[PDB]
Enzyme design. Structure first.
Site, short mmCIF file in Angstrom:
data_model
loop_
_atom_site.label_atom_id
_atom_site.label_comp_id
_atom_site.label_asym_id
_atom_site.label_seq_id
_atom_site.Cartn_x
_atom_site.Cartn_y
_atom_site.Cartn_z
N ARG A 89 14.94 -34.73 -21.30
CA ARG A 89 14.57 -34.73 -19.88
C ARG A 89 13.16 -35.27 -19.68
NH1 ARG A 89 19.03 -34.44 -16.62
NH2 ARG A 89 20.42 -32.75 -17.31
N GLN A 172 12.14 -21.21 -1.93
CA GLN A 172 11.12 -21.53 -0.93
C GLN A 172 9.77 -20.95 -1.32
OE1 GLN A 172 11.66 -19.83 2.94
NE2 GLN A 172 10.38 -21.36 3.97
N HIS A 176 6.74 -23.74 -2.72
CA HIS A 176 5.68 -23.90 -1.73
C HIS A 176 4.30 -23.55 -2.28
CE1 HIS A 176 8.93 -24.61 0.96
NE2 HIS A 176 8.17 -24.59 2.04
N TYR A 324 25.29 -23.92 -16.62
CA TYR A 324 25.54 -24.07 -18.04
C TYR A 324 26.03 -22.76 -18.65
CZ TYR A 324 22.93 -28.50 -17.92
OH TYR A 324 22.50 -29.78 -17.65
N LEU A 353 13.45 -34.44 -2.55
CA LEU A 353 14.75 -33.90 -2.94
C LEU A 353 14.76 -32.38 -3.07
CD1 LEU A 353 13.74 -33.54 -6.03
CD2 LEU A 353 14.96 -35.67 -6.47
N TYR A 354 13.64 -31.70 -2.83
CA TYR A 354 13.62 -30.25 -2.84
C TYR A 354 13.77 -29.65 -1.45
CZ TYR A 354 13.04 -26.86 -6.62
OH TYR A 354 13.26 -25.94 -7.61
N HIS A 357 17.33 -27.42 2.65
CA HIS A 357 17.62 -26.69 3.87
C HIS A 357 19.09 -26.30 4.06
CE1 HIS A 357 13.67 -28.47 4.53
NE2 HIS A 357 13.47 -27.56 5.47
N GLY A 495 15.62 -34.55 -10.38
CA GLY A 495 14.78 -33.37 -10.22
C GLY A 495 14.49 -32.64 -11.51
N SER A 499 10.97 -31.17 -12.52
CA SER A 499 10.91 -29.72 -12.65
C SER A 499 10.45 -29.31 -14.04
CB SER A 499 12.28 -29.11 -12.35
OG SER A 499 12.29 -27.71 -12.59
C1 HEM Z 1 14.06 -19.80 5.53
C2 HEM Z 1 13.63 -20.51 6.58
C3 HEM Z 1 13.08 -21.95 6.46
C4 HEM Z 1 12.52 -22.61 7.48
C5 HEM Z 1 12.32 -22.06 8.90
C6 HEM Z 1 12.13 -23.92 7.01
C7 HEM Z 1 11.51 -24.91 7.74
C8 HEM Z 1 10.67 -25.87 7.21
C9 HEM Z 1 9.59 -26.56 7.89
C10 HEM Z 1 9.16 -26.33 9.36
C11 HEM Z 1 9.04 -27.42 7.03
C12 HEM Z 1 7.85 -28.36 7.31
C13 HEM Z 1 8.23 -29.56 8.16
C14 HEM Z 1 7.06 -30.50 8.19
O1 HEM Z 1 5.92 -30.04 8.49
O2 HEM Z 1 7.25 -31.71 7.91
C15 HEM Z 1 9.74 -27.30 5.77
C16 HEM Z 1 9.48 -28.01 4.63
C17 HEM Z 1 10.00 -27.76 3.38
N1 HEM Z 1 11.06 -26.92 3.12
FE1 HEM Z 1 11.78 -25.47 4.39
N2 HEM Z 1 12.48 -24.01 5.68
C18 HEM Z 1 13.07 -22.82 5.30
C19 HEM Z 1 13.55 -22.57 4.03
C20 HEM Z 1 13.44 -23.39 2.92
C21 HEM Z 1 14.09 -23.18 1.64
C22 HEM Z 1 15.02 -22.01 1.29
C23 HEM Z 1 13.74 -24.17 0.82
C24 HEM Z 1 14.23 -24.30 -0.64
C25 HEM Z 1 13.76 -25.22 -1.49
C26 HEM Z 1 12.85 -25.06 1.55
C27 HEM Z 1 12.26 -26.22 1.09
C28 HEM Z 1 11.29 -26.94 1.75
C29 HEM Z 1 10.32 -27.84 1.16
C30 HEM Z 1 10.20 -28.18 -0.34
C31 HEM Z 1 9.55 -28.33 2.13
C32 HEM Z 1 8.39 -29.33 1.95
C33 HEM Z 1 7.09 -28.53 1.82
C34 HEM Z 1 5.91 -29.38 2.20
O3 HEM Z 1 6.05 -30.63 2.25
O4 HEM Z 1 4.82 -28.81 2.46
N3 HEM Z 1 12.70 -24.55 2.82
N4 HEM Z 1 10.73 -26.35 5.92
C1 LIG Z 2 14.79 -28.33 -19.23
O1 LIG Z 2 14.56 -29.26 -18.21
C2 LIG Z 2 15.14 -28.90 -16.98
C3 LIG Z 2 14.37 -28.30 -15.98
C4 LIG Z 2 14.96 -27.95 -14.77
C5 LIG Z 2 16.34 -28.21 -14.55
C6 LIG Z 2 17.09 -28.80 -15.53
C7 LIG Z 2 16.49 -29.16 -16.77
C8 LIG Z 2 18.43 -28.93 -15.00
C9 LIG Z 2 18.41 -28.40 -13.73
N1 LIG Z 2 17.13 -27.97 -13.47
C10 LIG Z 2 16.62 -27.33 -12.27
C11 LIG Z 2 16.28 -28.29 -11.13
C12 LIG Z 2 16.91 -29.52 -11.01
C13 LIG Z 2 16.59 -30.36 -9.96
C14 LIG Z 2 15.64 -29.98 -9.04
CL1 LIG Z 2 15.22 -31.06 -7.69
C15 LIG Z 2 15.01 -28.76 -9.15
C16 LIG Z 2 15.33 -27.92 -10.20
C17 LIG Z 2 19.71 -28.40 -12.93
C18 LIG Z 2 19.82 -27.88 -11.49
N2 LIG Z 2 20.96 -28.68 -13.59
C19 LIG Z 2 21.01 -28.84 -15.04
C20 LIG Z 2 19.73 -29.51 -15.60
#
Ligand code: HEM
Ligand SMILES: COc1ccc2c(c1)c1c(n2Cc2ccc(Cl)cc2)C(C)=NCC1
Ligand code: HEM
Ligand SMILES: *[C@@H]1O[C@H](CO)[C@@H](O[C@@H]2O[C@H](CO)[C@@H](O)[C@H](O)[C@H]2NC(C)=O)[C@H](O)[C@H]1NC(C)=O
Ligand SMILES: *[C@@H]1O[C@H](CO)[C@@H](O[C@@H]2O[C@H](CO)[C@@H](O)[C@H](O)[C@H]2NC(C)=O)[C@H](O)[C@H]1NC(C)=O
Ligand SMILES: COc1ccc2c(c1)c1c(n2Cc2ccc(Cl)cc2)C(C)=NCC1
Ligand SMILES: CCCCCCCCO[C@@H]1O[C@H](CO)[C@@H](O)[C@H](O)[C@H]1O
Ligand SMILES: *[C@@H]1O[C@H](CO)[C@@H](O)[C@H](O)[C@H]1NC(C)=O
Ligand SMILES: *[C@@H]1O[C@H](CO)[C@@H](O)[C@H](O)[C@H]1NC(C)=O
Ligand SMILES: *[C@@H]1O[C@H](CO)[C@@H](O)[C@H](O)[C@H]1NC(C)=O
Ligand SMILES: *[C@@H]1O[C@H](CO)[C@@H](O)[C@H](O)[C@H]1NC(C)=O
Lengths: 552, 552
Positions: A89, A172, A176, A324, A353-354, A357, A495, A499
Site C-alpha cells: 500500500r 467524523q 477532523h 477482511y 474522498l473522505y 456523508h 484512500g 490512510s
Molecule cells: C453528523 C453530521 C454531519 C454534518 C452536519 C456534516 C456537515 C459538514 C459540513 C458543513 C462540512 C463543511 C462544508 C464546508 O465548509 O465546505 C463538512 C465537511 C466534511 N465532512 Fe461532514 N458532516 C457530518 C458528518 C460527517 C461524517 C460522519 C463524516 C465521515 C467521514 C464526515 C466527513 C467530512 C469531511 C472529511 C469533511 C471535510 C473537512 C474539512 O474539509 O475541513 N462528515 N461536513
Molecule cells: C494497511 O494499509 C491500509 C490502511 C487503511 C485501509 C486499508 C489499508 C484498506 C482500507 N483502509 C481504510 C481506509 C480506506 C480508504 C479510505 Cl478513503 C479511508 C480508510 C479499506 C477500507 N479496505 C481494505 C484496505
C-alpha cells in the site's frame, strides 16, 4: 496552450514543456521508456504479467474464512501477511510531498509551505482549454444537476457491512483532526499543520489553546461534573474560542480541542470519551510515577492516546471497513527492516474522498427518540439528557448509510456535496480515470462499468458525454460497490495509501520512539498495544456498555 | 533528586525514573541488555570485535594515496565506498527528532514545535545536584577563566591544512542559513524553520521577504549596477529589513536574504556571487524554456542552486577539511536502496561545535590593504572599493587559522566565545565524555589525553578537577588535532553525522525529486552535477579568477 494539458506521460512519468508546443516525459524509475513512458522494460513486463488485480486481492482476503482463521492464530504467518499489506500500500505515496493546488511542478514553496494540502496528482494548468485537460466540453456539467440526478438520497440505503453511527461519528471525529480546511485562504489550504494524527482535536492546534484546556495538575485536562458525569469545561471557564450559534447558553458552550466539535453531539460524545481517557491515563502514569510532574504526565499521556488512536483505527475502524477475514495488526516493528518515510503531508484528494456523508441517516435515533437534523445539530443538551451510556447504546444499534452505490447523500447536507463537486473543480482536479491510472487501476471504459447499473450511467453519460471526463468525487459516491460492501474499488485503492501513510508515518512508530520508556514504561506500552474501541468505551462510559462499529 | 542525573544507562539506552529514587534503562534495539545496558549480545560482541576505531579509518582515508588514485577512477568502486561513508554516518542521528532544550523526555511538543533546536543528548534535569549531573562542584569554572587561559589567541596559529578565507567565509555564509538563533526566545530556539539547506540566506525566510527581493521578471532577484558590476539592491528601494549601524549610508545598505550579512564584506561577497548565479541560471532556464513564466523560472532556479550548494559543500568544502585522498561524491542515488529518512532537524550541538572563529585572522588583507576588525565590520564600502575579483584573489591567498589545538580564538571576538560557554551551560549541556559516548567514541581519561600536551591540560585540570566534567565547546577548541589537521576527533565524529543528515536529508535528494524534470530538464540537471567553487567564481566573478578553499 500548455503542451502538457493532455497529460501525455504515463506510468507516473513527469511532463515538462520544451518550448511552446513541445513536451518531454521524464520516465526516470517508472519502469517504462519511450515518448510518453509506455514501452515497458523486461523486468517490468514480468511484474505486469504477474501482479494480480486489486479485485482479486479483495476476493481472497474476504473469502476462505476457515483459511484466514488458521493464519490469524499463527503470529508468524499473520505478521508476514500484515507486512506485505503495509509495504504494498505505502509504495504509492510521494513522501516528501510534491505538488499542491498552486504548483503543477515541484518547487521549494510547495514543499516548505505547510499551509497547503498536498496533491497526489498535479492540478490542471490555467491555460488548458478544457477543465480536465483537452477532453470534454469547455464546461463540466452542472454541479446541482449531478447532485440531484445521481447523488441525492431518494430512499435511505443502509450500509450492507453493518456500519453504525458509532463508526460514522468516529470517522467524523477522527478525520477532523487533520481535515481542517482554512476557508480564509481557499479549499486547498489546511489549518492542521501537524498534517497527521497529533490529536490536536483533543489538545489544541497551538500551545496557547492547549494550556487553556489543561488543569496543570497531574497532567490532566480541565473538566466539569454535570449530574455526576464528567464533561468538557465551558468556554467561560477556559476562554478558548469555539464555534457556536449565538443562541447557545454559556453552560452548554463546551470547550474542546477542535473548535467545531460543538456542531453535533456525536462529535461531543467522542470528545467526552477521549477527554475521560486522557485523565484516566494520567491517573495510571501518576500511580506508576509519583515523581513525575504535571508537564511530563500530560505529555506522556498525550503520546499514549496517540498510540491508542492508531491502534483502534487500524485494528477496529479499518478492520470493519475492509471486511477482511485477516485480522489487521498495528505493529510498527513490521517496518523497521523496510524502506518507509516516517513523515506525512495530508493530501487534498484524501480530503475529497473522505466526505462520507451518505453514512448519515435521515434521523438520529437515541433511546426512543428520532431527532431530525434541525433538532440534532448544535444541541448538546441532547447529550446531557441521555448521557454517554444511552448515546453509545443507541448509536451502536442504529445502522449507517451506504457510501458507494449512488443516490444516498441525505438532502440535509446537499450543499456540502455540491461544494465537494464545485471545490474539486476550483482546485483543478484531474479526471477520475487519471486518478485511477495514478494508482495502478484500469480506467473505466464506460459509465455502466463504473456504476454497475444502467439508469445512473445513462444520466451520467448524458451529462459528462465521455467517461474520461468523469469527476473523481461524484464517481466515488455512485461507483459500483464491492459485493455487499460500502465502497467501490476507487475509494479503497486511493484512500488506503493515504490512510496508511498518515497512521504509520507518525513519529511514534519510528524505531527511536516505539519503545516502552517513551510511554512511561511497560504499563503505558500495554495501554497502546491492548487498545480497542470496546475497551475505550468500557473504561470511560458508565456501565461498560457493549459497543462496536457493526450492528448486531 | 532525579535518579537519572548520573546518566546511568549506557549505549544509548534511555533512562526513566521508576520512583523518587529508582530508575530503569530501556535497552530496546541497542544491542545491549542488563540494568544500565552494558551486557552485550552475541551479534554485539562480534561487531565490537570487528568495528575499527574512527582514528583508524581516518588514517586509511588520509594515507595510501596511490590506492585511492586507482579507486577514484573506478566508478563502481568509488560509488561503493561513498555508499559506505553515507550509511555508516547516518546511523547516529535521531530522525524523527527527539529532545530539545526543554524536554529530556520524548514529547509531542518536542517533536512538533519547529522553533526549537533539537538535541542529540537530552538536557540535564534542573534538579540535579551538579550542572553535569552528579559530578563536579556545584558550579562550573569561571567562563572568563576558561576563555582567557585556553582559548584566547596569543599568537596567530595558521591552519596546517591551508584553509583560506574563501573557505572561512564560505563556512560562515553557508552555515548561517540554518544557524539563526532566536535571541527573543533563547539560545535553544531557531528562526530557521527549514532546518536545513533551503537557501533562505539568499531568498529570505518568509514569503513576504522573498517577494521584496524578487524582480518578478524572468524569475530574477532584484539587483543594482554600481560601476558596471552587479550588486544586491539597497534597503532604500526594496524596504527589506537589514541589520546595519545607524551611520551606514542608504546606498551602502545592501539587501540580501539573510538580514545579518551586512556584518562583514566576506558574507556580502558570497551573497553577491550567489545572487549573480541565480539570475544566470534564470537566463539559462529561460533560454531552454522560453514558454515559462516568472514564478517557475524563479522556483526552478532555486532548486538548482540548492543542488549546486549541496554539490559544492560535499565535493569541495567537506572534501577540503576531511583531508581524504578518496574523492567524495554527491550522488543521491546511492541511498535509494538504503534505509534513510529524508528529513532533518537542526541540532543545538551542531550549532555549538560550528563556532569556528579560530579560522578568523587578526587582519583581513585585501590586495595591499590590511583591515582591522573595527575597519572590516559593517563596511561594505570595502567591497565596492576593491570589487569581487580582488576579494576572491585576496581571500584565496590569505590563510585561515587552526580551529583545534587550543588558544586561537581571536581577541576581537572574545565576547562571542564566552557566550558560547555560558549559553551552553544555560542550555544544560551534558559533559564532553557523555557526548563522546553518544557518538561511539572512547571517553577521555585525562586532560592531557584531550589536549595532547601539558600546559593547557594542567590549566584545565585546575579548573574542572575531573575530566568527566569537561564541557563540549571548549574541548573542541583545545582538543588535540589530527596530525597536521584543523580539527580533532570530537569535532569530526560529532559534526559529520549532523552535516550528512542536513545535506542528504534534503527533499531534492529523495527519489521523487532527483530527476531532470525537477530542475527544468537535462541542462539544469547538469548545472547541479558539474557545480564547484571554481565554476561558481568563474561564471560569476569578472575575469574568472582562480579560487580554492586551500592556499597555494
Ligand atoms: C453528523 C453530521 C454531519 C454534518 C452536519 C456534516 C456537515 C459538514 C459540513 C458543513 C462540512 C463543511 C462544508 C464546508 O465548509 O465546505 C463538512 C465537511 C466534511 N465532512 Fe461532514 N458532516 C457530518 C458528518 C460527517 C461524517 C460522519 C463524516 C465521515 C467521514 C464526515 C466527513 C467530512 C469531511 C472529511 C469533511 C471535510 C473537512 C474539512 O474539509 O475541513 N462528515 N461536513
Ligand atoms: C494497511 O494499509 C491500509 C490502511 C487503511 C485501509 C486499508 C489499508 C484498506 C482500507 N483502509 C481504510 C481506509 C480506506 C480508504 C479510505 Cl478513503 C479511508 C480508510 C479499506 C477500507 N479496505 C481494505 C484496505
Ligand atoms: C568574519 C567575521 C565574524 C564575526 C564578526 C563573527 C561574530 C559573531 C557574532 C557577533 C555572533 C553572534 C553570537 C550570538 O548571537 O550569540 C556569531 C555567532 C556564530 N558564528 Fe560568527 N563571526 C564571524 C565569522 C564566523 C565564521 C568564519 C564562522 C565559521 C563557521 C562563524 C560561525 C558562527 C556561528 C555558527 C555562530 C552561531 C550563530 C547562531 O547560532 O545564530 N562565524 N559570530
Ligand atoms: C514553541 O515553544 C515556545 C516555548 O514554549 C513557545 O513560545 C512561547 O509562547 C508563549 C505564548 O504561548 C509565550 O508566552 C512565551 O514567552 C514563549 N516562550 C518563548 C521561549 O518564546 C512557542 O509558541 C512554541 N511554538 C509553537 C508553534 O507552538
Ligand atoms: C503559503 O502560501 C500562501 C499562498 O501562497 C501564503 O499566503 C499569502 O501570504 C502573503 C504574505 O506572505 C499574502 O500577501 C497573501 O495574501 C497570502 N495569500 C493567501 C492565499 O493566503 C502563505 O503566507 C504561505 N505560508 C508561508 C509559511 O510561507
Ligand atoms: C558524508 O558525511 C559527511 C558529511 C560531512 C563531513 C563528513 C562526512 C566528514 C567531515 N565533514 C564535514 C564537517 C564535519 C563536522 C562539522 Cl562540525 C562540519 C563539517 C570532516 C570534517 N572530515 C571527515 C568526515
Ligand atoms: C431526492 C431527489 C430530489 C431530486 C430528484 C429530481 C431530479 C431528477 O432526477 C431524476 O430522478 C429520477 C428518480 O430518482 C431518476 O429516475 C432519474 O434518472 C433522474 O433524472
Ligand atoms: C503518446 O505517444 C505516441 C507515440 O508513441 C503519440 O502518438 C501520442 O501523441 C502520445 N500521447 C499524447 C497524449 O500526445
Ligand atoms: C434539543 O434537544 C432537546 C432534547 O433533549 C429538545 O427538547 C429540544 O427541543 C432541542 N432543541 C432544538 C432547538 O431542537
Ligand atoms: C550500573 O550497574 C551497576 C551494576 O551493573 C550498578 O552497580 C550501578 O549502580 C548502576 N548505575 C551506575 C550509575 O553505575
Ligand atoms: C571603511 O572602509 C573604507 C575603505 O573602503 C575606509 O576608508 C573607511 O575608513 C572604513 N570605515 C571605518 C569606520 O573603518
Amino acid at each position: 496552450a500548455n503542451p502538457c494539458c493532455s497529460n501525455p506521460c504515463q506510468n507516473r512519468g513527469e511532463c515538462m514543456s520544451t518550448g511552446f508546443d513541445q513536451y518531454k516525459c521524464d520516465c526516470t524509475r517508472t519502469g517504462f521508456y519511450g515518448e510518453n513512458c509506455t514501452t515497458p522494460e523486461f523486468l517490468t513486463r514480468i511484474k505486469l504479467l504477474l501482479k494480480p488485480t486489486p479485485n482479486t486481492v479483495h476476493y481472497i482476503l474476504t473469502h476462505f474464512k476457515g483459511v484466514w482463521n488458521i493464519v490469524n492464530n499463527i503470529p508468524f504467518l499473520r505478521s508476514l501477511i500484515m507486512k506485505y499489506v503495509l509495504t504494498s500500500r505505502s509504495y504509492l505515496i510521494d513522501s516528501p510531498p510534491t505538488y499542491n493546488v498552486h504548483y503543477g511542478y515541484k518547487s521549494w514553496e510547495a514543499f516548505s509551505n505547510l499551509s497547503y494540502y498536498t496533491r497526489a496528482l498535479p492540478p490542471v494548468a490555467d491555460d488548458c482549454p478544457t477543465p480536465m485537460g483537452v477532453k470534454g466540453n469547455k464546461e463540466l456539467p452542472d454541479s446541482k444537476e449531478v447532485l440531484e440526478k445521481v447523488l441525492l438520497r431518494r430512499e435511505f440505503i443502509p450500509d450492507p457491512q453493518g456500519s453504525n453511527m458509532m463508526f460514522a461519528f468516529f470517522a467524523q471525529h477522527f478525520t477532523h483532526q487533520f481535515f481542517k480546511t482554512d476557508h480564509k485562504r481557499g479549499p486547498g489550504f489546511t489549518r492542521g499543520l501537524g498534517h497527521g494524527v497529533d490529536l490536536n482535536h483533543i489538545y489544541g492546534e497551538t500551545l496557547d489553546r492547549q494550556h487553556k484546556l489543561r488543569l496543570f495538575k497531574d497532567g490532566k485536562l480541565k473538566y466539569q461534573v454535570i449530574g455526576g458525569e464528567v464533561y468538557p469545561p465551558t468556554v467561560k471557564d477556559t476562554q478558548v474560542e469555539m464555534i457556536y450559534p449565538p443562541h447557545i447558553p454559556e453552560n452548554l458552550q463546551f470547550a474542546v480541542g477542535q473548535e467545531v466539535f460543538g456542531l453535533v453531539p456525536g462529535l461531543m460524545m467522542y470528545a467526552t470519551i477521549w477527554l475521560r481517557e486522557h485523565n484516566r491515563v494520567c491517573d495510571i502514569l501518576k500511580q506508576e510515577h509519583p515523581e513525575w510532574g504535571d508537564e511530563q504526565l500530560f505529555q506522556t499521556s498525550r503520546l499514549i492516546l496517540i498510540g491508542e488512536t492508531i491502534k483502534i483505527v487500524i485494528e477496529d475502524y479499518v478492520q470493519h471497513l475492509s471486511g477482511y477475514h485477516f485480522k489487521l495488526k498495528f505493529d510498527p516493528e513490521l517496518l523497521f527492516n523496510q524502506q518507509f518515510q516516517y513523515q506525512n503531508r495530508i493530501a487534498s484528494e484524501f480530503n475529497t474522498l473522505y466526505h462520507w456523508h451518505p453514512l448519515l441517516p435521515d434521523t438520529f435515533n437515541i433511546e426512543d427518540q428520532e431527532y431530525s437534523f434541525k433538532q440534532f445539530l448544535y444541541n448538546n443538551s441532547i447529550l446531557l439528557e441521555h448521557g454517554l451510556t444511552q448515546f453509545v447504546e443507541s448509536f451502536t444499534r442504529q445502522i449507517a448509510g451506504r457510501v458507494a452505490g449512488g443516490r444516498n447523500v441525505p438532502i440535509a447536507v446537499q450543499a456540502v456535496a455540491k461544494a465537494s463537486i464545485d471545490q474539486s473543480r476550483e482546485m483543478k482536479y484531474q479526471s477520475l480515470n487519471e486518478y485511477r491510472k495514478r494508482f495502478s487501476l484500469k480506467p473505466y471504459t464506460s459509465f455502466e462499468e463504473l456504476t454497475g447499473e444502467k439508469e445512473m450511467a445513462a444520466e451520467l453519460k448524458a451529462l459528462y458525454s465521455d467517461i474520461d471526463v468523469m469527476e473523481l468525487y461524484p464517481a466515488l459516491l455512485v461507483e459500483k460497490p464491492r459485493p455487499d460492501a460500502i465502497f467501490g474499488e476507487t475509494m479503497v485503492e486511493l484512500g488506503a495509501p493515504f490512510s496508511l501513510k498518515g497512521l504509520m508515518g507518525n513519529p511514534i512508530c519510528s524505531p527511536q520512539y516505539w519503545k516502552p520508556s517513551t510511554f512511561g514504561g511497560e504499563v503505558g506500552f500495554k495501554i497502546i498495544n491492548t487498545a480497542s474501541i470496546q475497551s475505550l468505551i468500557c473504561n470511560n462510559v458508565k456501565g461498560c456498555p457493549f459497543t462496536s462499529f457493526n450492528v448486531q
